[PDB]
Amino acid sequence: LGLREIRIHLCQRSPGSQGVRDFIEKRYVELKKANPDLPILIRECSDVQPKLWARYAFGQETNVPLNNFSADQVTRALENVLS
Amino acid sequence: TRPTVRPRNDVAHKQLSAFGEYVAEILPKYVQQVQVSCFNELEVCIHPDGVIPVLTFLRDHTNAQFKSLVDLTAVDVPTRQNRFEIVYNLLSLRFNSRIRVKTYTDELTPIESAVSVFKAANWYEREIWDMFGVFFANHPDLRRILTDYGFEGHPFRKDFPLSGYVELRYDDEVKRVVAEPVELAQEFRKFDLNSPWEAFPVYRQPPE
Amino acid sequence: NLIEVFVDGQSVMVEPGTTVLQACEKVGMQIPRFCYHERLSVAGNCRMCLVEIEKAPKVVAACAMPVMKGWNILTNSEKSKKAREGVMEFLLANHPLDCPICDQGGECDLQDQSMMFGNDRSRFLEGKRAVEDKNIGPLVKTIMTRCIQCTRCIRFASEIAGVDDLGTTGRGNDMQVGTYIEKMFMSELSGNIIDICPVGALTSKPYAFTARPWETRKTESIDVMDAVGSNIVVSTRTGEVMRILPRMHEDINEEWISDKTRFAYDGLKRQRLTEPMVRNEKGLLTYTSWEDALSRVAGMLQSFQGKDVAAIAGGLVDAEALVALKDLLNRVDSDTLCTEEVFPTAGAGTDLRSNYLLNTTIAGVEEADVVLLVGTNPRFEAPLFNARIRKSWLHNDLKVALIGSPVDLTYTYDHLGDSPKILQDIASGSHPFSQVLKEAKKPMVVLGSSALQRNDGAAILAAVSSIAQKIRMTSGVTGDWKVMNILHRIASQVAALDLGYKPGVEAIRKNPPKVLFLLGADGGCITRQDLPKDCFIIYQGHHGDVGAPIADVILPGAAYTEKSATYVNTEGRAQQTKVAVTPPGLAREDWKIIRALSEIAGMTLPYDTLDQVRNRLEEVSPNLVRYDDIEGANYFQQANELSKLVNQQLLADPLVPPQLTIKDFYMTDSISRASQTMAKCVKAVTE
Amino acid sequence: GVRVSPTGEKVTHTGQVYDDKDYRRIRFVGRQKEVNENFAIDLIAEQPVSEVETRVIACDGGGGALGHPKVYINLDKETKTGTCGYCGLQFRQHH
Amino acid sequence: KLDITTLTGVPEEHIKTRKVRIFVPARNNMQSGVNNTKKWKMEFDTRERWENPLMGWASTADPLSNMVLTFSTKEDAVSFAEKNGWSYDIEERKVPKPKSKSYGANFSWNKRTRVSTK
Amino acid sequence: FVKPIFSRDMNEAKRRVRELYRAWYREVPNTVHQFQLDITVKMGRDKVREMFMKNAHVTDPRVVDLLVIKGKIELEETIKVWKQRTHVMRFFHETEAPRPKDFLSKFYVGHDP
Numbered sequence A: 001l002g003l004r005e006i007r008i009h010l011c012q013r014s015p016g017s018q019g020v021r022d023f024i025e026k027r028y029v030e031l032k033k034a035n036p037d038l039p040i041l042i043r044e045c046s047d048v049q050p051k052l053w054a055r056y057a058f059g060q061e062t063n064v065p066l067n068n069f070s071a072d073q074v075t076r077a078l079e080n081v082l083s
Numbered sequence B: 001t002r003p004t005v006r007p008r009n010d011v012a013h014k015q016l017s018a019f020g021e022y023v024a025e026i027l028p029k030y031v032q033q034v035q036v037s038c039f040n041e042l043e044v045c046i047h048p049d050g051v052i053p054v055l056t057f058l059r060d061h062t063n064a065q066f067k068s069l070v071d072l073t074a075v076d077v078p079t080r081q082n083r084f085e086i087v088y089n090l091l092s093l094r095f096n097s098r099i100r101v102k103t104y105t106d107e108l109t110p111i112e113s114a115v116s117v118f119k120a121a122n123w124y125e126r127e128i129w130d131m132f133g134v135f136f137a138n139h140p141d142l143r144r145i146l147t148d149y150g151f152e153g154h155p156f157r158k159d160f161p162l163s164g165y166v167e168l169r170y171d172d173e174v175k176r177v178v179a180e181p182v183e184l185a186q187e188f189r190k191f192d193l194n195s196p197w198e199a200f201p202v203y204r205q206p207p208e
Numbered sequence C: 001n002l003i004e005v006f007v008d009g010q011s012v013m014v015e016p017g018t019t020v021l022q023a024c025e026k027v028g029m030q031i032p033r034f035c036y037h038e039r040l041s042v043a044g045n046c047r048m049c050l051v052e053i054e055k056a057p058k059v060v061a062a063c064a065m066p067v068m069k070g071w072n073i074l075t076n077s078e079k080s081k082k083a084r085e086g087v088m089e090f091l092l093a094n095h096p097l098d099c100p101i102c103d104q105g106g107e108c109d110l111q112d113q114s115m116m117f118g119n120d121r122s123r124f125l126e127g128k129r130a131v132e133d134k135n136i137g138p139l140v141k142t143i144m145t146r147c148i149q150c151t152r153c154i155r156f157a158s159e160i161a162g163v164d165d166l167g168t169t170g171r172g173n174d175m176q177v178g179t180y181i182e183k184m185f186m187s188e189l190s191g192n193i194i195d196i197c198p199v200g201a202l203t204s205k206p207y208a209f210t211a212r213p214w215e216t217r218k219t220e221s222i223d224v225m226d227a228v229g230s231n232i233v234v235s236t237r238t239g240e241v242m243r244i245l246p247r248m249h250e251d252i253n254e255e256w257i258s259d260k261t262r263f264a265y266d267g268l269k270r271q272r273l274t275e276p277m278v279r280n281e282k283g284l285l286t287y288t289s290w291e292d293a294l295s296r297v298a299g300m301l302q303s304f305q306g307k308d309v310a311a312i313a314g315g316l317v318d319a320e321a322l323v324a325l326k327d328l329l330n331r332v333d334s335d336t337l338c339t340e341e342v343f344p345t346a347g348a349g350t351d352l353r354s355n356y357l358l359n360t361t362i363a364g365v366e367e368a369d370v371v372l373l374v375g376t377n378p379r380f381e382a383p384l385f386n387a388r389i390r391k392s393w394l395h396n397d398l399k400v401a402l403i404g405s406p407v408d409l410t411y412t413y414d415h416l417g418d419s420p421k422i423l424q425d426i427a428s429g430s431h432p433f434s435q436v437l438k439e440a441k442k443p444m445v446v447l448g449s450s451a452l453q454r455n456d457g458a459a460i461l462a463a464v465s466s467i468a469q470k471i472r473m474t475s476g477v478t479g480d481w482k483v484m485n486i487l488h489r490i491a492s493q494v495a496a497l498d499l500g501y502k503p504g505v506e507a508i509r510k511n512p513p514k515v516l517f518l519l520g521a522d523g524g525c526i527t528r529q530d531l532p533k534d535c536f537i538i539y540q541g542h543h544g545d546v547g548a549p550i551a552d553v554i555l556p557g558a559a560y561t562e563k564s565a566t567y568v569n570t571e572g573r574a575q576q577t578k579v580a581v582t583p584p585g586l587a588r589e590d591w592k593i594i595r596a597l598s599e600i601a602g603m604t605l606p607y608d609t610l611d612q613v614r615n616r617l618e619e620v621s622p623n624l625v626r627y628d629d630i631e632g633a634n635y636f637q638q639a640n641e642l643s644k645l646v647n648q649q650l651l652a653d654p655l656v657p658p659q660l661t662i663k664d665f666y667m668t669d670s671i672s673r674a675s676q677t678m679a680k681c682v683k684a685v686t687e
Numbered sequence D: 001g002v003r004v005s006p007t008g009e010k011v012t013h014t015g016q017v018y019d020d021k022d023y024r025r026i027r028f029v030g031r032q033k034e035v036n037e038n039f040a041i042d043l044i045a046e047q048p049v050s051e052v053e054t055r056v057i058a059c060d061g062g063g064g065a066l067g068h069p070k071v072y073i074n075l076d077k078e079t080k081t082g083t084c085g086y087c088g089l090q091f092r093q094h095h
Numbered sequence E: 001k002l003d004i005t006t007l008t009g010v011p012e013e014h015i016k017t018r019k020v021r022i023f024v025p026a027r028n029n030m031q032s033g034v035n036n037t038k039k040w041k042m043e044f045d046t047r048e049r050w051e052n053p054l055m056g057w058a059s060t061a062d063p064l065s066n067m068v069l070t071f072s073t074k075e076d077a078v079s080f081a082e083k084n085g086w087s088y089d090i091e092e093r094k095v096p097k098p099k100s101k102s103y104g105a106n107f108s109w110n111k112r113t114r115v116s117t118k
Numbered sequence F: 001f002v003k004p005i006f007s008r009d010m011n012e013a014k015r016r017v018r019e020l021y022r023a024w025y026r027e028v029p030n031t032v033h034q035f036q037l038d039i040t041v042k043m044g045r046d047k048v049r050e051m052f053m054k055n056a057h058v059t060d061p062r063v064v065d066l067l068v069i070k071g072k073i074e075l076e077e078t079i080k081v082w083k084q085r086t087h088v089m090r091f092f093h094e095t096e097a098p099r100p101k102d103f104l105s106k107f108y109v110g111h112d113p
């Protein structure tokens, strides 16, 4: 119930995406190391806001936009959605 | 250059031209282009807000009594926002002259009605109302010519199908003729006969 | 910079060098032509290009003479017209009187330009020559008589096709370009010559006599017969598909689509899932209304939510049906998401999306100063791309060499042995060939996607990742080059991986009853031994080949041109299909049946229109909503490589492409399989 | 002697007769389906093959401007007859 | 949004059911002529057309299906579909990229162009 | 911006429509008897209310007033005992089959969009 698939969206160039870009370039290897099971799909899409889908039980999905968030705040959301 | 070719009448082109600048003088406020082709066929612009005041002047002598509105020929080009291109063909009988003086309008512009001025346009009116939707200044009645009664469409808008959406037939238990959805058999099997490779370099709009 | 030369009146900043042709064609003026071709090569034969320069004593060849300053070019000038008249009087001096029976005769370029130029009356008084017919293939009939010594076809053939059987023969009168000897021309791009023929000399046999160009509508889209994702203009007529033509695009086909795709359409005309076919008490299927079969599968799929269900994705299948079906599996939390070809995922490569992408565009290949390939030959997966290779080989000049096999590519390539040694000797950089890899900048590293499987192909994966990283270590790379890339042959896995459903590993084929079939074209990866008990297995392909009979309670569905469902190119390019002739009978839009089953399942999908499922794609993909956007942030090999090295797999023998040779290339998907032209053609290449 | 369908009605010269399942066959009931007695196909090969010792020839279909456009049939290969693209009738160069 | 959805006589069904297609028409592959790539045009999406039970004719569904419309520019066509209330899909122009060419480029022993006999 | 047909802002227009409704709403029985419509007259008034509902999304006063221009023009043909009974019945489309907006039925019918 805690998760099945999780995924994020990211502007290729926008300032509100940049800290997140730096994050995926760093710690993503660690978080991905943490979870052999549940995928953390990531997309390059220049959708107006960086995004965070997270499926739970029976396909329901949380969706927090990542506009104007630092990578530390991003991670701050990330531990919150472990379940 | 002759047995097949139609000879070019320079003389009438000269006279029509000179008269064209003459008119260009006379009504600077609405008159624009003074087109003069080798067909001996002169043409002139009018702004739609300038429909009536020009036309009335035309009927009255200057050196051309533009008597008899022979036609209010109409064309619709969807590209231009001023899609409509109302044209006043005219003929000054005393001077045996012919001229084509056109305009433009949008869908909700109440272009001036020459009904008071010519009255010949009591129907050039209602056709070009009905086929299109070119609303007109002040006419005794805007009831439709040609197209039926309950009919909703505006064919000659160069829009919606040549068959139209409507195809009526008598029906049994209703004991009466009823309009129905088209269902054409065989369908107008349109041929695209357009030719790549321009035959007329002399024309040709630049790629720009 | 650019030299100045005058079009008739206007001054023009024309490029240094370059022909008068491109000069007039900059202002938009267009010179009459035949033998010349825009992406071929200049040839002086058939001088329709004649024009006089403003100071020219006599007319020049506009398609060939390089521009230079101080010239002026009155294309409309009388002498040039006398010249064109000189050409057309002669071409028609001996041409056959057979416009009407010509398949090209309804649209031949010779005709249009016969209208544009040349005297209306002719003055022949003797006896024209006429050559005998000269067969060069089952699928490319050649009437000849008609060919105008224009040599565009040999310059195509000898070059990009790589085959040289075609060519000139003889001199003086009764000279002919008829190829020597009886032997058929053959090529994997044999069909494209048909397009390139100005006249009716090279009329295709399968399409012969069938139709006339003006009648046809030209509905457009893209083919999925290749993973190349080539664009297409389709000449349908009267609800029937009359012929396929490529739609040009420099990033992809550059107006030279696969000969296999070109005759694919015929296969749509063979057997089709026309009506629903539910097995009876006898276990035999019978024709059935949708309410029956769909209420039945509605009776099955409410039973086994979550576990004990799976879904066999096809290779040609549209992404949308996958979207709705996985959403169905979401509502029941059925995690299973299996897909035809498996793709290895050390550190889970589905996430980075870039992993499976051919990160360099086919357009981007030309700038590479060095290119390498691994495993399957490009031509039996991307013949277009093979032509791109040979074109670069004829132009850009760079090394290429095969690994794992010496398959008969048209261009020169260094021979190399097999993976276990080569991959490590190159990963080490010890291999002299790898020393050449350090030697040259703008690297490219290709892998046959067939080798991604290879049981222990994960070894080749980590190996090649180490290789590309090592060549990055060699530096001289811009670093944004995205050296790491592969050639997918599948039309569907790339989008499913954009959605990252699963690696597609078939090891899952364990317990689940009531697996659903999407296409299910192969008898290989899946079969009914997965569940000894029930053989109940739902199906929604369109041709009945292989997968359909195994399945029960069959559910017929649309072919690709009919649906407007989208497809993703291997370069990550997104491009939707558009509607054409619509499904033949009870066949319908593919995912619509899914939304219907879900609607009966008590878990109806929130979106209604296909435009609204596309609206859903933005809230998940989110890249399917955007079409021409190949570009993105690109995750870079840093984070990528790190989990690749936290695994490692043993390398092995052997390493062979699936397709081997030409004769095996004619039967892949259900349309290519069922197409009759394919059967005749494979029997041709046999005996 | 048109080939007879299982229903018994004669097939069209372009063979296409309706299936026994086919309800549409009902239209012919009470009436007569019509198909031409004289198939052109048999009449194509019925004719003797004309032969001329020369080489290239010029068929006109019989009748100046009463037939197909003038056409130059080649006879490069004696292994085969030179069927017209129009008349459909064969030619050969006997020697 | 100057909708003329009611000002036009069109049935609401045909304006609801479908989006139209704005685009610039492609050059013939089979023919040299670039000439029709110029001038934009918009066309409605094709629908199913069942065969006539008699005589095997086409039996068209949607009446409007054969419509076609030229435009000077793309924003022009977008403006029409906006004025008229139908949904649409913009498509880009496709002028071929310029290619450097020269008569001698075919030759030269070193360039491996060479070609052959001529 | 551009010069208006007649009414400027909605109320100059809204005034015209009500003038229209009554112009129909009183006229209806006259029509019921001239053509001897078999419809109960309240059905006629209901249809009168309905055609005034289809035009609910109108927002430009030029669109409103142009619609009442055309609608009064239709009233012309109605009152003058032009048209025929059939033309009056064209508004009903009773010969036509009902349309199931439900998507599932739309699946069941045909290829459709």
Ligand code: SF4
Residues within 6 Å of the ligand: C095, C096, C097, C098, C099, C100, C102, C103, C104, C105, C106, C107, C108, C109, C110, C111, C146, C199, C200, C201
């Ligand atoms: S090739 Fe062009 S010209 Fe020659 S016959 Fe066929 S159509 Fe007529």
Ligand code: SF4
Residues within 6 Å of the ligand: C146, C147, C148, C149, C150, C151, C152, C153, C154, C177, C196, C197, C198, C199, C201, C202
């Ligand atoms: S095919 Fe016949 S006509 Fe077309 S180019 Fe080659 S030779 Fe000239």
Ligand code: FES
Residues within 6 Å of the ligand: C032, C033, C034, C035, C036, C037, C042, C043, C044, C045, C046, C047, C048, C049, C050, C063
């Ligand atoms: S155009 Fe190629 S030579 Fe005349």
